[PDB]
Design a binder for this molecule. Sequence first.
Ligand code: LMJ
Ligand code: CA
Ligand code: CA
Ligand code: CA
Ligand code: CA
Ligand code: ZN
Length: 143
Amino acid sequence: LTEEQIAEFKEAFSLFDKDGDGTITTKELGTVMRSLGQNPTEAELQDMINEVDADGNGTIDFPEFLTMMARKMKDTDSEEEIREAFRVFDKDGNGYISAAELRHVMTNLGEKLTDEEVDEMIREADIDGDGQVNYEEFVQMMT
Ligand SMILES: CC1(C)c2[nH]c3cc(Br)c(Cl)cc3c2C[C@@]23CN4CCC[C@]4(C[C@@H]12)C(=O)N3
Ligand SMILES: [Ca+2]
Ligand SMILES: [Ca+2]
Ligand SMILES: [Ca+2]
Ligand SMILES: [Ca+2]
Ligand SMILES: [Zn+2]
């Protein structure tokens, strides 16, 4: 969270990433674990990576290492990032994105949409039919 903490985690990442290619492999993670007296199996090292492996490529990049350093699972971390995006649109903070809020924030992000384009976007995302898009409907719209 803090600028100091993140700088500490970047130091740790660079240490673990011995070849400097920007990703931590099971081999690199195993070296560290064994220097700290553990004896994880190859399967257990792979599970440690899979727990934070948001993009599914089987190695840890720095954004996923931040998840690991926060001691979180990738599902918790992804939900937090989706909610950050949701709050960009939910300007009044009431937990629902209105047509006006969607039109407004989209316009200020450079996407000029017609009023009809906006109405249909809300209608498509609005599962329960209340005329607004709540968080779980937002999650579903992004699949
Ligand atoms: C245009 C888009 C697909 C889109 N369509 C929407 C419909 C509704 Br109802 C609401 Cl509220 C918001 C959006 C957005 C905002 C989004 C979400 N996408 C996740 C990855 C890429 C992208 C694209 C974009 C993103 O960065 N912001
Ligand atoms: Ca590496
Ligand atoms: Ca990855
Ligand atoms: Ca709102
Ligand atoms: Ca709704
Ligand atoms: Zn993340």
